[PDB]
Write a protein that binds this ligand. Structure first.
Ligand code: CA
Ligand code: MG
Ligand code: MG
Length: 430
DNA sequence: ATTTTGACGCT
DNA sequence: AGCGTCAAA
């Protein structure tokens, strides 16, 4: 009752660029705008592997992970943009730089946590308090929320999408108590106003469109973000949680899309997030561990406390290349040449990072996969990273992995290598 | 033969 | 330290 926390203490947004790599290429090449198009890596094997897909192409059934040749079977007029190749490998520099454009715009509004190349969490609690102070009890106009959906509305006693959006928004604003500066629903509504402003700023200053979720924590903000894409934002209030979760597959909640979610479904014999409410905290801890159990018990009630971390920059800088099937590296020379290619890209990115961000990586992580291993990585070794020098880094990586070569022949490498990975970690201020 | 990434938990 | 999990374009 009066002491039961409700996880309504924060306003958190998650902003996620729509079909990000596609928008980067469409900004660059106007011929691709408003077309079924996709971004692809490589080209020789089955036309290349698709990594990003415009919504026009998605209407034909084109998806990520599809080979371009097969996507062309579904969408004959599909246009393609190729990822840059440098030093024999795909190079994602263009997308990292576009990401920096968006992250720097978002950081003007609030502290952000970079969650991936194209998405960031925003802690809007403080910004909401100031905006509420400026508003001075003034009602919030639907005009301030031109692209916002209120999850769960309209409800109760138009057949077009925008009509429904406005109906729900009208119901929500009609119900709001604007005189209580401490109302969680009001705080979320002001948050959504700020996110409308953030998203307009991103589109104005970059050309890129995005979607966003606004809620009281990161998990609900992420889930909300996905409910109305593209180019829209969704507010998930605390009160919307019971109905939303009553038919929400467990796997749709962030961190439950893999084995743990599968085990929750299998062990408990449930399908939807809301069904978790029927278990005690101790029961959930008994099956999934103390930490997971406490997290699940609160999350199924819409409560999560993971903070928006103040971190705009990635914590590691890595380069990697797979060598599938017959291309697996089977000679020492091959392994050293590709280690050099990776190390040269890594050096270029590390030097840029050091100049821009006043930091230096101090550890080099070397990871390989050997042909015949189910795991993504077969082996991981670290060494000191003391100089931004590609030849030294590639030599050091070879030194830490050379004993993995079973082969009795000095010139040959066995078992052949199907993956190489170099990652600079453990940054210190400089 | 999705590939190339990036964060964080466990022991 | 090294491995595993979950997630992104
Ligand atoms: Ca996205
Ligand atoms: Mg996606
Ligand atoms: Mg994303």
């Amino acid at each position: 009752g009066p002491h039961m926390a409700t996880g309504q203490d924060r306003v958190v947004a998650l902003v996620d660029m729509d079909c990000f790599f596609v928008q980067v290429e469409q900004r660059q090449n106007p011929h691709l705008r408003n077309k079924p198009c996709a971004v692809v890596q490589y080209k020789s094997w089955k036309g290349g592997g698709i990594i990003a897909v415009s919504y026009e192409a998605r209407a034909f059934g084109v998806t990520r992970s599809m080979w371009a040749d097969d996507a062309k079977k579904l969408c004959p007029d599909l246009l393609l943009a190729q990822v840059r190749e440098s030093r024999g490998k795909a190079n994602l520099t263009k997308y990292r730089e576009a990401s920096v454009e968006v992250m720097e715009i978002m950081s003007r509004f609030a502290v952000i946590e970079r969650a991936s190349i194209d998405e960031a969490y925003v802690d809007l609690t403080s910004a909401v308090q100031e905006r509420l102070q400026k508003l001075q009890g003034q009602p919030i106009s639907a005009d301030l929320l031109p692209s916002t959906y209120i999850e769960g509305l309209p409800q109760g006693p138009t057949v077009q999408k925008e009509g429904m959006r406005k109906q729900g928004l009208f119901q929500w604003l009609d119900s709001l108590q604007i005189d209580n500066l401490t109302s969680p629903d009001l705080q979320l509504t002001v948050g959504a106003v700020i996110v409308e402003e953030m998203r307009a700023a991103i589109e104005r200053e970059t050309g890129f469109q995005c979607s966003a979720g606004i809620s009281h924590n990161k998990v609900l903000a992420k889930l909300a973000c996905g409910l109305n894409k593209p180019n829209r934002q969704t507010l998930v209030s605390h009160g919307s949680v019971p109905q939303l979760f009553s038919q929400m597959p467990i796997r749709k909640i962030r961190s439950l899309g893999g084995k743990l979610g599968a085990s929750v479904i299998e062990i408990l014999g449930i399908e939807y997030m809301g069904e978790l409410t029927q278990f005690t905290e101790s029961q959930l801890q008994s099956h999934f561990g103390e930490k997971n159990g406490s997290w699940l018990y609160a999350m199924c009630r819409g409560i999560e406390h993971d903070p928006v971390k103040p971190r705009q920059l990635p914590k590691t800088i890595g380069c990697s290349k797979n060598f599938p099937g017959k291309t697996a590296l089977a000679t020492r020379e091959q392994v050293q040449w590709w280690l050099l290619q990776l190390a040269q890209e890594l050096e270029e990115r590390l030097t840029k990072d050091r100049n821009d961000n006043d930091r230096v990586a101090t550890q080099l992580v070397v990871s390989i996969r050997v042909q015949g291993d189910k795991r993504l990585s077969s082996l991981r070794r670290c060494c000191a990273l003391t100089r931004y020098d590609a030849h030294k880094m590639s030599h050091d990586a070879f030194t830490v992995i050379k004993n993995c070569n079973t082969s009795g022949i000095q010139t040959e490498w066995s078992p052949p290598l199907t993956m190489l990975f170099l990652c600079a970690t453990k940054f210190s201020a400089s």
